[PDB]
């Protein structure tokens, strides 16, 4: 159990050799801290630019829950019901291609140059928004591409487990959830999942202007500590 390392604007070669090729997480500083988003994206700005648009919203504590569901509403409705007014349930505008929907917002972000070290096309990079209140939780899971998760507003608590530790994370048996752990990271049932207790991990609090590199297939768990807006870039 240790902290994810933080590096200020490392060279492309240093990132490639020490992090990308070996598949090791790192937080990059001084890279996204000057996105216009970092100063422009307030709730008021998001309402002005996106408020009338329809977005998918996940409702419930964790997508692994039984009562969890997905609905559609405007961004203004999402803010009113799940952020500003004392909300009744946790809602999360998660994993949504908001920048394709609202191209004006693309002007406020940039793809990190480190993504050019991959073997894929820039036109195939997928950019997703993650916008929600304090307390959203994305259960421990792994993704099939590299990721840069950029924090714009608020902070997130992140726990990372290597693919080498997959046995101790008890992936779901069904094919559709095989990329998700059965374990609740922050309150694990150690009578049912004893191997989880000894599995090593990295953790961090990701703050505005920071980029977390999540290597392909690295298991990650994310809880928002404040009202939060993150932007993920999936690339190969
Ligand atoms: O930010 C979150 O809640 C979860 N993020 C991701 O799983 C991701 O960027 O791939
Ligand atoms: Mn993910």
Author numbering: 181 to 416
Task: List passages from the publication reporting this PDB structure.
JMJD5 is a JmjC domain-containing protein, present in both the nucleus and the cytoplasm. Building from an extensive peptide-based screen for potential JMJD5 substrates, our results provide evidence that JMJD5 is a JmjC-hydroxylase, catalysing the stereoselective C-3 hydroxylation of arginyl residues in sequences from proteins involved in chromatin stability (RCCD1) and translation (RPS6). Consistent with previous reports, JMJD5 residues 174–416 fold into mixed helical and β-strand topology comprising seven α-helices, 13 β-strands and 3 310 helices. Like most 2OG-oxygenases, the JMJD5 active site contains a metal centre, which is octahedrally coordinated by an HXD..H motif (H321 and D323/βII, H400/βVII), the 2OG oxalyl group and a water molecule, which is likely replaced by a dioxygen during catalysis.
Initial attempts to obtain JMJD5.substrate (with both RPS6 and RCCD1) complex structures yielded a crystal structure of JMJD5.RPS6 complex (Complex 1) in which difference electron density (Fo–Fc) was only observed for the RPS6 target arginine near the active site in two side-chain conformations. In both conformations (A and B), the nearly overlapped RPS6 argininyl-guanidino group is apparently tightly bound via a salt bridge with E238 (which is the only acidic residue within 12 Å of the active site metal) and a cation–π interaction with Y243, which is located on the β3–β4 loop N-terminal to DSBH. In conformation A, these interactions project the target argininyl C-3 hydrogens towards the metal (metal–β-CH2, 4.1 Å). By contrast, in conformation B, the argininyl C-3 is ~9.0 Å away from the metal centre indicating that in conformation B, the residue is not positioned in a catalytically productive manner. The lack of observed difference density (Fo−Fc) for the RPS6 peptides, excepting RPS6-R137, suggests that JMJD5 likely forms an unstable/less stable complex with the RPS6 fragment, possibly reflecting the relatively high Km value for RPS6 (60.4 μM). A unique feature of substrate binding at the JMJD5 active site among the JmjC enzymes analysed concerns the crystallographic observation of two conformations for the substrate arginine sidechain—one apparently productive and one not. The non-productive conformation as observed for both RPS6 and RCCD1 in JMJD5 Complexes 1/B, 2 and 5 (but not in ycfD or FIH) may reflect a substrate entry/product release route, though a role in binding one of the other arginine residues present in the substrate sequence at some stage in catalysis cannot be ruled out.
